[PDB]
Design a protein around this ligand. Structure first.
Ligand SMILES: Nc1ncnc2c1ncn2[C@@H]1O[C@H](COP(=O)(O)OP(=O)(O)OP(O)(O)=S)[C@@H](O)[C@H]1O
Ligand SMILES: Nc1ncnc2c1ncn2[C@@H]1O[C@H](COP(=O)(O)OP(=O)(O)OP(O)(O)=S)[C@@H](O)[C@H]1O
Ligand SMILES: *N[C@@H](CCCNC(N)=[NH2+])C(=O)O
Ligand SMILES: *N[C@@H](CCCNC(N)=[NH2+])C(=O)O
Ligand SMILES: [Mg+2]
Ligand SMILES: [Mg+2]
Ligand SMILES: [Mg+2]
Lengths: 4, 877
């Protein structure tokens, strides 16, 4: 998750 | 050494302009006040062995090692302290190159100004510099362990207050385009622009990214179903949760090979890539089931081909990168054993979340993967061909990205744009598996594997095997389509004596146009017709409230000297910067001791005007008119005297001035005169009796005229603006109760006292006056207030503000009494024999003033708080  | 005060400046400030991030400390030199470095035993050697890097400081000599020569000749410790602070935060990787040291008015205190990159890091460096210097002067050296501890703390502070590379790139692009950006305090959100023109991002999600699209992208099966319903070639797959369903699912997918993956996982936990028989499928299913958070497992057909990551911004394909997994090539007749560490010794590879190319981690799982390769450690590659270490094709493992943006087939571009629009994402990262991205996904058996919201473009701005793509530029184009910044018109009003009235008049005039005006004044912060916040609200902390409101179209900010001194300006630039006047009244506060320093401080607003903006200056004030130079953008003069030579010369070559010529507020556009109003039909001027109100009206009218506001709107706003309690809280307020009249004002300095007298002296009735001043002002100011009150009034009631700001109680009252006594003794005959008495309570003072008001008299009140006088006169009808 986050900056995939 | 004793640190007395530590302030941080975040915008244009007194010390510098274009150097927004500064820290200023009041440093007390209790014992080393006049001790030079040459007179301190062993100071130079200890300092130069503690920090040899100081040899790089090109000081006032301007040559390599000049600061060292300055220390040699003997220098004050403030200079070496600022230099050691610069070097201390420079060693931590933060480049800073600004520093100043000044002698304050008080005896033993210096002011030291240090440029910073991080606020906490800058404050820590400033605090540590004095400790380092004190340790050097006390012992001759600083311990290396403490120096390393301080550097590690500085590095930790730099890392902690750092954005991510995606946010860093987007913010850098926004800065390059001149679009303002601020950091919100909630969820690491960055706000671009101001008011109604603002946008928000977190890392890659924008404020226009949909919840539904993100949630659909996060759902693998839902995304596959939606894309299949749209004809997009997704892989043929199925879901399974029990062991017995595996064989049926494998039959459904169409045979072998297949892929087993978990529904929910991170970093590809328990995902097999290629299995071709039963038993390996069983162990892969067990691994994925124990890796999934919900026990359920996807099984799909395996599709051969390379893995590409396609970035789609605003429905357009911006970058395409093929992910080649970790591999080595034996073209130099060398095997795996040498190359695994040969690649690791390349400067491109690095760890953390900054260097995208990671070291080739030889894990036990990686050992197993290279076991399935069919070769071994020393098995030399055949012919010099690629041999892989893993199959996930990820940068974290140590793989590479190859730019393929110029080779993607146009049909593929259309299909991927459709995929991004169908899912509902403005920025999307699509994973494609295909043998050739240059051919349509129908000819080859290419598939869309997944869609990712908030993708990282870290591999597209540094492919390492191709051309970098400006992803941040594309994002900023999506956020701000044209050549448009996110700015709204900002009008910053500064000056000594008319900021609040001018700000309110400007707000009213712009309100005449159909625009929502957010303006901050001394009374409070307003948005449109409603009060958004109470209090003083004249610093940047209240400018942020206006500039971040999603409904504000024009910002009008009263910029007092206090906010500029404390933390600078709340904005980088202003569309209009108005300077009304600079009078040396409240000197001594801060480092401001001369009227030249006060003019320099108030000139920050004038020098912050953008090149397309305007600076509205008082031509009648020599100090304000001196700000004509060193101003980027046009200059517009306003003068109460129509024969001002400077204003006339300015209008002859160019124009854009404002004057009060023949009972008329007029705008000069060069050789053209445009009259607005008779200045007796303007209520605040009080039939032209108050000249200072006319000057404020001139400034406001010129400011709105420079921005293209129609003359009709200016006229309507000037006519409909009232100087009563309904609009003006305590500015030139008349109250009529029949027998006499009450004037409540906000006069607390000699200049406003003179302006007040210039209108009061015309009243034909008795003059009673309650005067006072803040306790943090100089004694001479109180004497001037007393003598002016003696000159203008007939009955004097001296009161001292309850919030005395540290001054002993009473002192100001008896000193105003001394001033009134001096003025009384300066008169020979009974020309003006005004009676004087002092009571220190606001309620008692106003009650006494209102009790003995004769017929047709005028009672002037200058209270600490306007609401007190308003309530007291409202109660008595
Ligand atoms: N059906 C498939 N056919 C061929 N290759 C596939 C298939 N499914 C996945 N892959 C490959 O495996 C990689 C990882 O697949 P993902 O669907 O991303 O699994 P994951 O659990 O989401 O792992 P991450 O965290 O997204 S990298 C893809 O980038 C493809 O290279
Ligand atoms: N152009 C002017 N020149 C001199 N005195 C003025 C001028 N405009 C207004 N004044 C007087 O100064 C008083 C105080 O100024 P205001 O405009 O009410 O507030 P202010 O200028 O913001 O003062 P501060 O900085 O908030 S304490 C007013 O009540 C007027 O009597
Ligand atoms: N890639 C990432 C996107 C999840 C949505 N992001 C936020 N911040 N809600 C993921 O978890 O797959
Ligand atoms: N992926 C994202 C991570 C940085 C944002 N997260 C936090 N905690 N600041 C990025 O910006 O690349
Ligand atoms: Mg993926
Ligand atoms: Mg994914
Ligand atoms: Mg004010």
């Amino acid at each position: 998750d986050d900056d995939d | 050494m004793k640190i007395l005060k530590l302030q941080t400046l975040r915008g244009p400030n007194y010390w510098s302009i274009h150097r927004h991030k500064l820290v200023v400390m009041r440093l007390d030199l209790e014992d080393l006040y006049e001790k030079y470095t040459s007179d301190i035993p062993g100071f130079y050697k200890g300092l130069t062995e503690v920090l040899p890097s100081l040899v790089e400081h090109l000081c006032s000599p301007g040559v390599k090692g000049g600061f060292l020569t300055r220390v040699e000749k003997g220098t004050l410790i403030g200079h070496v302290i600022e230099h050691v602070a610069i070097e201390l935060q420079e060693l931590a990787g933060m480049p800073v190159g600004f520093g100043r040291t000044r002698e304050t008015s008080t005896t033993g205190v210096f002011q030291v100004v240090i440029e910073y990159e991080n606020e906490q890091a800058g404050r820590y460096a400033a605090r540590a510099a004095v400790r380092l210097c004190q340790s050097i002067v006390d012992t001759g050296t600083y311990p290396a362990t403490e120096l390393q501890q301080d550097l590690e703390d500085l590095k930790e502070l730099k890392n902690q207050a750092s954005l991510g590379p995606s946010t860093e790139a987007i913010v850098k692009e926004a800065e390059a385009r001149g679009i303002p950006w601020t950091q919100l305090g909630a969820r690491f959100m960055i706000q671009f622009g101001y008011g109604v023109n603002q946008k928000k991002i977190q890392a890659t999600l924008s404020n226009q990214t949909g919840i539904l699209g993100v949630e659909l992208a996060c759902d693998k099966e839902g995304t596959k179903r939606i894309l299949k319903d749209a004809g997009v070639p997704v892989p043929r797959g199925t879901v399974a949760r029990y062991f017995d369903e595996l064989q049926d699912a494998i039959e459904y997918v169409g045979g072998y090979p297949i892929v087993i993956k978990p529904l929910d996982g991170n970093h590809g936990r328990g995902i097999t890539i290629d299995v071709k028989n039963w038993q390996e499928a069983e162990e892969a299913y067990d691994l994925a089931r124990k890796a999934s958070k919900t026990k359920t497992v996807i099984v799909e057909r395996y599709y051969t081909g390379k893995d590409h990551r396609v970035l789609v911004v605003n429905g357009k394909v911006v970058a395409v990168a093929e992910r080649v997994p970790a591999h080595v090539v034996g073209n130099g007749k060398s095997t795996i054993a040498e190359l695994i560490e040969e690649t690791n010794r390349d400067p491109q590879r690095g760890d953390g979340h900054d260097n995208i190319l990671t070291r080739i981690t030889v894990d036990k799982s990686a050992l197993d993967i290279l076991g399935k390769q069919g070769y071994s450690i020393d098995s030399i590659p055949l012919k010099g061909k690629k041999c892989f270490l893993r199959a996930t094709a990820n940068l974290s493992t140590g793989g590479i990205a190859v730019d393929r943006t110029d080779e993607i087939h146009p049909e593929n571009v259309w299909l991927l744009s459709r995929v991004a629009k169908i899912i509902g994402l403005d920025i999307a990262g699509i994973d494609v598996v295909t043998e050739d991205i240059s051919q349509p996904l129908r000819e080859v058996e290419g598939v869309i594997v997944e869609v990712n919201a908030a993708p990282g473009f870290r591999m597209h701005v540094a492919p390492s095997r191709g051309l970098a793509r400006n992803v941040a530029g594309a994002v900023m184009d999506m956020l701000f389509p044209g050549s448009k910044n996110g700015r709204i018109p900002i009008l910053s009003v500064t000056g000594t004596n008319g900021k609040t009235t001018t700000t309110r008049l400007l707000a009213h005039i712009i309100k005449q146009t159909g625009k929502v005006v957010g303006y901050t004044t001394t009374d409070g912060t307003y948005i449109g017709e409603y009060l958004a916040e109470t209090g003083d609200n004249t610093g940047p902390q209240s400018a942020h409230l206006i500039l971040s409101d999603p409904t504000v179209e024009v910002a009008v900010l009263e910029t007092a000297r206090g906010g500029i001194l404390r933390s600078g300006l709340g904005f980088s630039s202003c569309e209009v910067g108005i300077v009304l006047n600079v009078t040396a009244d409240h000197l001594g506060i801060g480092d401001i001791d001369t009227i030249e320093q006060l003019a320099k401080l108030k000139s920050v607003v004038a020098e912050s005007v953008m090149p397309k903006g305007y600076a509205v200056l008082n031509a009648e004030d020599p100090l304000v008119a001196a700000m004509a130079d060193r101003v980027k953008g046009q200059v517009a003069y306003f003068s109460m005297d129509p024969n001002n030579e400077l204003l006339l010369r300015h209008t002859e070559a160019g124009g854009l001035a404002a004057i009060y010529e023949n009972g008329y507020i007029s705008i000069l556009k060069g050789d053209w005169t445009l009259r607005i109003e008779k200045a007796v039909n303007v209520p605040i001027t009080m039939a032209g009796k108050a000249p200072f109100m006319i000057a404020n009206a001139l400034a406001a009218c010129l400011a709105v005229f420079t921005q293209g506001v129609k003359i009709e709107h200016i006229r309507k706003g000037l006519s409909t603006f009232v100087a009563s309690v309904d609009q003006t809280p305590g500015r030139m307020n008349m109250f009529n109760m029949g027998s006499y009249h009450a004037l409540v004002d906000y006069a607390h300095n000699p200049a406003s006292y003179e302006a007040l007298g210039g209108f009061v002296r015309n009243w034909p009735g008795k003059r009673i006056g309650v005067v006072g001043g803040p306790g943090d002002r100089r004694d001479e100011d109180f004497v001037s207030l007393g003598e002016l009150a003696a000159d203008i009034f007939d009955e004097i009631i001296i009161k001292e503000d309850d919030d005395t700001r540290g001054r002993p109680r009473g002192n100001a009252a008896e000193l105003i009494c001394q001033g009134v006594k001096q003025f009384l003794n300066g008169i020979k005959n009974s020309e003006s024999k005004a009676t004087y008495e002092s009571i220190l309570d606001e309620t008692a003072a106003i009650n006494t003033a209102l009790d003995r008001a004769p017929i047709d008299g005028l009672v002037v009140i200058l209270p600490e708080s306007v609401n007190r006088a308003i309530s007291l006169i409202e109660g008595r009808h």
